[PDB]
Design a protein around this ligand. Sequence first.
Ligand SMILES: OC[C@H]1O[C@@H](n2cnc3c(NC4CCCC4)ncnc32)[C@H](O)[C@@H]1O
Length: 278
Amino acid sequence: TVFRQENVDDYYDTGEELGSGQFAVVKKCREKSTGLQYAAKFIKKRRTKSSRRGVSREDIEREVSILKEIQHPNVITLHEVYENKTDVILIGELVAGGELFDFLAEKESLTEEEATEFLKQILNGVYYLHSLQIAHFDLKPENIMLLDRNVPKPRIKIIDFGLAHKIDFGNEFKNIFGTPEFVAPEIVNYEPLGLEADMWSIGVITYILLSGASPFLGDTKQETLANVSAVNYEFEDEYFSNTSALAKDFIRRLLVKDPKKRMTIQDSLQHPWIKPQF
Ligand SMILES: OC[C@H]1O[C@@H](n2cnc3c(NC4CCCC4)ncnc32)[C@H](O)[C@@H]1O
């Protein structure tokens, strides 16, 4: 599939840099014709077939195709796509209140109500995605943005669909691998992957929201990955003595090695706490 090949500078002005990945930079921008503001993600293209640098056409097209489908208050929208020789440029929804997650770093420890207010929104976004058989595969606090701080009212949107896949046969087998602290054992063990991997990541995010501590983090990436595969975590009393038994129960039912035994997104919404690499 091809994208708009006019110069993006003829239609938009860019401003502040909003963030970065290894092969991507995101900038605030403004559409000249409407004055409306967006975020433009510039993704570096591969310069050859066998190149390790940049993102393959197939991977870019997949992200774009997923972004085109989705429309939900807790997930980003896509506005336009441009491309030139070096970049594909996604123009989408500007989320201006920063990462979850710089908010977690700047702020003191959260109450359970605070944590569940964020968490319920993440669950609603993921419920939408999973209903569509879309696995995000990269859920982590850096990919949960506030829309808003300020309106607190602290509404969120899930971002960065670079690893997302349609799961039309129950699982995908192709070496998808996110950030060690947040990946499920099946990712670590290079096993077939499905919607369940996202539910594990939600358990990790929930543990961090409540405690300020990362459940599997070691001093090196290999240690982190070994910890994940072995389900080597515990609830430290120093961090969790204030925390309700139901909150711990919710996390315990997500941080389960066997994907088939892990809570699903629907299970997570019915749970008594919620129900109203190298
Ligand atoms: O993903 C790298 C970092 O850039 C930041 N980031 C990524 N995407 C966005 C975005 N809108 C997406 C709509 C479609 C294109 C962009 N809006 C604001 N910040 C973003 C965030 O800090 C993230 O951790």
